[PDB]
Each structure stands twice: as C-alpha cells, then as structure tokens.
Design an enzyme around this catalytic site. Structure first.
Site, PDB file in Angstrom:
ATOM      1  N   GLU A  97      39.775 -40.846   6.049  1.00 21.05           N
ATOM      2  CA  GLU A  97      40.431 -42.157   6.185  1.00 21.05           C
ATOM      3  C   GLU A  97      41.888 -41.667   6.739  1.00 21.05           C
ATOM      4  O   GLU A  97      42.245 -42.723   7.465  1.00 21.05           O
ATOM      5  CB  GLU A  97      40.420 -42.760   4.974  1.00 21.05           C
ATOM      6  CG  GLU A  97      41.386 -44.132   5.041  1.00 21.05           C
ATOM      7  CD  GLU A  97      41.494 -44.871   3.647  1.00 21.05           C
ATOM      8  OE1 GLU A  97      40.907 -44.302   2.614  1.00 21.05           O
ATOM      9  OE2 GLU A  97      42.283 -45.899   3.644  1.00 21.05           O
ATOM     10  N   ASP A 131      32.708 -44.074 -10.825  1.00 21.14           N
ATOM     11  CA  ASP A 131      31.949 -43.837 -12.188  1.00 21.14           C
ATOM     12  C   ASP A 131      33.055 -43.759 -13.473  1.00 21.14           C
ATOM     13  O   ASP A 131      33.908 -43.422 -13.112  1.00 21.14           O
ATOM     14  CB  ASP A 131      31.306 -42.367 -11.985  1.00 21.14           C
ATOM     15  CG  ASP A 131      30.058 -42.476 -11.279  1.00 21.14           C
ATOM     16  OD1 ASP A 131      29.097 -43.422 -11.372  1.00 21.14           O
ATOM     17  OD2 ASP A 131      29.604 -41.373 -10.545  1.00 21.14           O
ATOM     18  N   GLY A 142      29.274 -73.314  12.831  1.00 25.99           N
ATOM     19  CA  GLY A 142      29.242 -72.140  12.552  1.00 25.99           C
ATOM     20  C   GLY A 142      30.758 -71.664  12.232  1.00 25.99           C
ATOM     21  O   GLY A 142      31.745 -71.533  13.031  1.00 25.99           O
ATOM     22  N   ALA A 189      26.676 -66.875  17.152  1.00 22.44           N
ATOM     23  CA  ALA A 189      26.701 -67.718  18.432  1.00 22.44           C
ATOM     24  C   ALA A 189      27.272 -68.968  18.373  1.00 22.44           C
ATOM     25  O   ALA A 189      27.246 -69.726  17.371  1.00 22.44           O
ATOM     26  CB  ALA A 189      25.114 -67.843  18.801  1.00 22.44           C
ATOM     27  N   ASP A 224      15.285 -57.660  14.053  1.00 24.96           N
ATOM     28  CA  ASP A 224      15.672 -59.106  13.191  1.00 24.96           C
ATOM     29  C   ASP A 224      14.651 -60.115  13.105  1.00 24.96           C
ATOM     30  O   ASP A 224      14.899 -61.369  13.053  1.00 24.96           O
ATOM     31  CB  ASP A 224      17.123 -59.604  13.587  1.00 24.96           C
ATOM     32  CG  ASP A 224      17.753 -60.389  12.551  1.00 24.96           C
ATOM     33  OD1 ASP A 224      17.633 -60.320  11.504  1.00 24.96           O
ATOM     34  OD2 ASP A 224      18.262 -61.543  12.941  1.00 24.96           O
TER      35      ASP A 224
HETATM   36  N1  ANP Z   1      39.313 -43.720   0.358  1.00 20.08           N
HETATM   37  C1  ANP Z   1      37.919 -43.505   0.670  1.00 20.08           C
HETATM   38  N2  ANP Z   1      37.370 -43.863   1.899  1.00 20.08           N
HETATM   39  C2  ANP Z   1      35.925 -43.621   1.916  1.00 20.08           C
HETATM   40  N3  ANP Z   1      35.249 -43.184   0.984  1.00 20.08           N
HETATM   41  C3  ANP Z   1      35.675 -42.909  -0.309  1.00 20.08           C
HETATM   42  C4  ANP Z   1      37.094 -42.825  -0.559  1.00 20.08           C
HETATM   43  N4  ANP Z   1      37.251 -42.410  -1.782  1.00 20.08           N
HETATM   44  C5  ANP Z   1      36.213 -42.068  -2.186  1.00 20.08           C
HETATM   45  N5  ANP Z   1      35.020 -42.174  -1.474  1.00 20.08           N
HETATM   46  C6  ANP Z   1      33.722 -41.880  -1.569  1.00 20.08           C
HETATM   47  O1  ANP Z   1      32.922 -42.561  -2.604  1.00 20.08           O
HETATM   48  C7  ANP Z   1      31.926 -41.702  -3.282  1.00 20.08           C
HETATM   49  C8  ANP Z   1      32.527 -41.294  -4.768  1.00 20.08           C
HETATM   50  O2  ANP Z   1      32.410 -42.650  -5.507  1.00 20.08           O
HETATM   51  P1  ANP Z   1      31.465 -42.562  -7.047  1.00 20.08           P
HETATM   52  O3  ANP Z   1      31.316 -43.856  -7.443  1.00 20.08           O
HETATM   53  O4  ANP Z   1      31.991 -41.543  -7.696  1.00 20.08           O
HETATM   54  O5  ANP Z   1      30.446 -42.301  -6.092  1.00 20.08           O
HETATM   55  P2  ANP Z   1      28.774 -41.801  -6.999  1.00 20.08           P
HETATM   56  O6  ANP Z   1      28.894 -40.371  -7.308  1.00 20.08           O
HETATM   57  O7  ANP Z   1      27.683 -42.213  -5.822  1.00 20.08           O
HETATM   58  N6  ANP Z   1      28.871 -42.880  -8.273  1.00 20.08           N
HETATM   59  P3  ANP Z   1      28.112 -44.444  -8.120  1.00 20.08           P
HETATM   60  O8  ANP Z   1      29.136 -45.372  -7.592  1.00 20.08           O
HETATM   61  O9  ANP Z   1      28.015 -45.193  -9.665  1.00 20.08           O
HETATM   62  O10 ANP Z   1      26.741 -44.304  -7.378  1.00 20.08           O
HETATM   63  C9  ANP Z   1      32.195 -40.277  -2.443  1.00 20.08           C
HETATM   64  O11 ANP Z   1      30.942 -40.227  -1.512  1.00 20.08           O
HETATM   65  C10 ANP Z   1      33.480 -40.301  -1.555  1.00 20.08           C
HETATM   66  O12 ANP Z   1      33.171 -39.906  -0.430  1.00 20.08           O
END
Ligand code: ANP
Length: 519
Positions: free
Chosen positions: A165, A273, A329, A334, A440
């Site tokens: 990002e 998480d 819309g 469209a 679709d």
């Molecule tokens: N600034 C950001 N931009 C884009 N993606 C991000 C950013 N920060 C974190 N992530 C993504 O978020 C994910 C981690 O979030 P997390 O929720 O811990 O994933 P998870 O381990 O699948 N847990 P859950 O959300 O409960 O399924 C990773 O795949 C990161 O690449």
C-alpha cells in the site's frame, strides 16, 4: 457474567476478556504455526490472569471456525483444557460472526451489510431473515492472501499488506489486469498471477502495486455495492485485517456516500484477530440460553455463518434504507433512454461513472463492458439465441443503441410460468455449447416477448474450460436461490432440462458443478 476468549485460527494467537457490559477488561494478541500457538497460549493466559483473576471467569469461549485445519485443533485443545481446569462452561464461536459482532459493539453501528476481508477470508455478510447470511465471496483466495502472495514474490516483508500500500502511493501507471466478478462473487487467482507476470514484464513496482490495489479493491466494492442493493441496510461495515488499508477504506466510503449509507470500521484492536471478539460472541450466545457439551465443541474449518442459530438479536434493527418502486438508479450500472431510429423502437444504454473508482480504471471498466456487451449480444445470434439488434456502439461515450424488447423480464413471470426457466436453460446451453460464458446469469437478464431474449452481456468471456461453464451455472443457481427462493427446486430442476435438451456435455459440467460446491 464475564468471559475469556481464545483466538488462533491461523498465524496470530490472541486471548481476551469481556464483561456482559461490553467492557474489554483485557485483550492481547501476538504474532506448523499450530506449534507457535500452544507455544505462547499459556504465556498470554498468565498475563491476562494478572489483570483479571481466574476464579471470576464464568465462560470460556473459543474460535471454532472457519479456519486452518491443524492450527484450530490446538486452540480448541487449549480452551477445552482450561474450561475443566475451572469447572466452568465452554462454548464454540463462529469466527466471522465474531468479527461482525465486535464491530457492532465498538462503532455503534447497529446492523450492517459487512465486508469481511483478511488473509484467509473475503465475504460480504448481512443479518437477513433470522440468520447471518453470505452475499458475495471469493471463489478462490482472500484479498489478504492474494496480496501477501504477491508481496513474497516481489520480495517484500511478510505481512505483505502495509508494504504494497506504501509503494502504491507512488504509482503513476495503471497497468492492465483482469477485473473478474462472477455474479456476486469475485476471483483473485487471475489478478494475482497477472500481477506476477507484469512484474516479470518489467512494469515498475510502484505501478504494479497501485494497480493490484485499485483492481482488487474496486472488485470488493462492486461486490459490496451489488450486495447492498439486495438489502435495505442503511450502514456498511468493514472488518478484518485488510481493513487497515486506507485506500480500501477510502473507496468504500465514497461508494457509501454516493448511496446514502453511513460507513463503519472498528478500532485496530478489534479489526484483526483477537480474543475479545471471541469472548463477546460467546458471552452473547450464552447470555441468551446457549450451553455447549464438551462433545459439541468439535472443530469445523468449514463453518458457514448460517450454520449458527442467531439468538442474541431481538431488538430494533437500527437504520434501514427505503426501497421505492421504479425509482431511478442512484448507484446503477446503466442509464437507459427509450428512443426511435429508422422507425424501430430502441434503447440507448449508457454505463455511467462510478464515483468511488479511479477514473482511469473506471473509463476502462465501462469501456470494456459496453464493447463486450455489443460483441456477444450480436455474436450470440449465430447460435439461434434471440437477442436485441445492436444498432450502434460508442466507446468514447459507453453508449449502445439497441433493440427494444417489449415484454416482461424472466423474474416477473418465471414463477407462474415455468416454461420460462426452460428457455433460459436452452440459451445458457447454447452459450456453453459455443464456449461462450455469461458471467452474470440472473432472471432479470432475460426478457420475454414471444420468445426469450438475453438483454445483458456486459461481462462475457470466450472460454472453453469446463470449470468456467460450471461456475457459470453456480452464479445462476445462487441468483435463483436469492430472488426466487420459495420456488427454487422447481425453477432449477426445470432450467436443467432446458440445458439438457441443448448441451450434450451437460453431465460433465453438472458433475464438475457438484465438485466445486464442496471446495
Ligand atoms: N494496510 C493493509 N493493506 C492491505 N492489506 C493488509 C493491510 N494490513 C494488513 N493487511 C492484510 O490483512 C491480513 C491479516 O489480517 P488478519 O485479520 O490477521 O488475517 P487472518 O489471519 O486471515 N485473520 P481473520 O481476519 O480473522 O481471518 C494479511 O493477509 C495482510 O496482508
């Protein structure tokens, strides 16, 4: 009543404690990896037990799914153990609902259409008719994963999200990547591999990142927006580790603003998480009559949100939208004018700007979509499929002049007249027989005069892989389910017959269909 929660379904392992009051007494979270869970689980439980004492915990709750097979077994073991080592009750919790729920608590949203995005999940979910129901989702891999996978390949540090990002804010060129949206769902595998090959082709890193972003995020927003309109929800919420992204947030708000729906993201602490979301949903299900047997906490990594009996909502569902009649819309694909040309009743169809997206992408998306629609609407006539005549196409303006089909669209007739489900089948079959793919299929796509016409082909691809033909049917299947639920089994068992009479290869794809509906 006050509860302890154990979270560890992938990489992170977290634990937390919440009151019935909705007060987070403690919440901590540190980063196969299933060993790394039982490794530090007891380290955290101690740290928690300093700030709150062991004997005043009344429940243990734990993340029962969905999740990574092995690593779920561990977390469950830890919580199963500790429930008995306190002689206190234990309940299992849906991971995703926990996300949406801790959102509710810590944003004063009251009932959202929520986009849940992370490393292992990509779902849009909303509380509709008694259960937490899924609207659109990834068909292969979560945005979180697509991102990380790209990050690694391009050699960036791993949790790849923040780094992609960053680099993206420097990006000037918007590179050509697939935009794939299949009904209400999205795929990423393509996007991912296509970023990989573009990197290989020596596009500059900044440009790739920016584009993989704009693409991915746009997809999610369309998928979210679409889903919104199959709802009267007045508020959108965004949960999961990918929510950390400022640009994704940025897009979503714009879409939201332009649809008069207020937008929520919950604090970092509860966004990714954490044990505290697990504590609450436990506490919520239990507070209202759910107890769980030690035998009833078997792990399920497939855990849908419908699999769970929602018994903690009974109150006023917050702020809702009003769904009027033929009313214009507001955020529609469209703009349709009626007109006359060479004494033919005719439609002029324009694909308007979508304000949330980057103009370059927007101009490409509506440019591609109109062309394709002209390409296939005409092409599909060579296969005996009734379709409007393309009179004129206009790529600088995204306009198509085409035939006006007087009649009712399948949706408004299909239920009472079942023959109309058959005619859809036959068209799809004829499409599939010619390695043509609608992306679709829905009953609002076909109009009935004396015969039945396809009237939209904005997302068609030519593909000859059985896989693509199976997911074609799966999008239509879901469409039939979501809009003609009560008369489904009839419509579907009839549609198949129309597809039977027309495509010989029908079993090989219907069998491959029943395969995908398990992965
Ligand atoms: N600034 C950001 N931009 C884009 N993606 C991000 C950013 N920060 C974190 N992530 C993504 O978020 C994910 C981690 O979030 P997390 O929720 O811990 O994933 P998870 O381990 O699948 N847990 P859950 O959300 O409960 O399924 C990773 O795949 C990161 O690449």
């Amino acid at each position: 009543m006050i509860c302890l929660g154990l979270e560890g379904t992938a990489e992170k392992t977290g634990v937390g404690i919440v009151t019935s009051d909705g007060e987070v007494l403690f919440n901590k979270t540190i980063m196969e990896a299933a060993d790394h869970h039982a490794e530090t689980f007891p380290k955290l439980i101690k740290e928690a037990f300093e700030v709150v004492d062991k004997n005043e915990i009344d429940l243990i709750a734990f993340s029962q799914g969905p999740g990574l097979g092995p690593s779920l077994r561990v977390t469950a073991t830890v919580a199963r153990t500790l429930s008995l080592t306190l002689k206190k009750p234990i309940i299992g919790v849906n991971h995703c609902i926990a996300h949406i729920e801790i959102g509710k608590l810590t944003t004063e949203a009251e009932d959202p259409l929520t986009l849940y995005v992370s490393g292992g999940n990509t779902q849009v979910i909303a509380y509709v008719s008694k259960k937490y129901r899924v609207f659109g989702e990834t068909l292969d891999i979560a945005v979180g994963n697509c991102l990380d996978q790209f990050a690694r390949y391009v050699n960036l540090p791993h949790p790849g999200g923040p780094y992609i990002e960053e680099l993206a804010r420097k990006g000037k060129k918007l590179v050509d990547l697939p935009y794939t949206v299949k009904g209400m769902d999205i795929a990423f595998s393509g996007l991912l591999t296509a970023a990989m090959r573009a990197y290989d082709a020596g596009e500059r890193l900044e440009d790739i990142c920016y584009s993989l972003q704009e693409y991915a995020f746009s997809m999610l927003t369309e998928i979210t927006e679409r889903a919104l309109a199959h709802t009267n929800k007045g508020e959108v919420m965004l949960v999961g580790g990918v929510a950390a992204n400022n640009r994704l947030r940025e897009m979503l708000k714009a879409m939201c603003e332009g649809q008069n729906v207020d937008f929520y993201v919950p604090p970092k602490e509860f966004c990714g998480d954490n044990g505290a979301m697990i504590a609450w949903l436990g506490l919520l299900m239990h507070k209202n009559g759910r107890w769980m047997s030690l035998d009833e906490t078997k792990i399920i990594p497939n855990y849908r949100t419908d699999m769970v009996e929602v018994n903690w909502i009974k109150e006023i569902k917050g702020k809702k939208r009003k769904i009027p009649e033929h009313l214009i819309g507001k955020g529609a694909e469209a703009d349709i004018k009626r007109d006359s040309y060479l004494d033919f009743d005719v439609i002029i169809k324009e694909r308007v700007k979508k304000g949330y997206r980057d103009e370059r992408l927007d101009e490409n998306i509506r440019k591609s979509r109109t062309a394709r629609e002209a390409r296939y609407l005409a092409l599909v006539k060579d296969f005996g499929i009734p379709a409007p005549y393309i009179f004129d196409v206009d790529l600088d303006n995204k306009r198509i002049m085409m035939s006006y089909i007087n009649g009712k669209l399948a949706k408004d007739v299909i239920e009472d007249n079942l023959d109309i489900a058959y005619k859809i089948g036959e068209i799809v079959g004829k499409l599939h027989k010619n390695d043509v793919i609608h992306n679709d299929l829905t009953t609002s796509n076909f109009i009935f005069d004396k015969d039945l016409y396809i009237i939209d082909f904005g997302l068609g691809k030519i593909s000859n892989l059985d896989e693509d033909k199976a997911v074609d049917l799966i999008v239509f299947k879901k469409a039939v389910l979501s809009t003609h639920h009560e008369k489904f089994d009839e419509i579907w068992e009839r549609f198949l017959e129309g597809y039977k009479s027309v495509y010989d290869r029908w079993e090989i794809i219907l069998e491959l269909m029943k395969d995908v509906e398990r992965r």
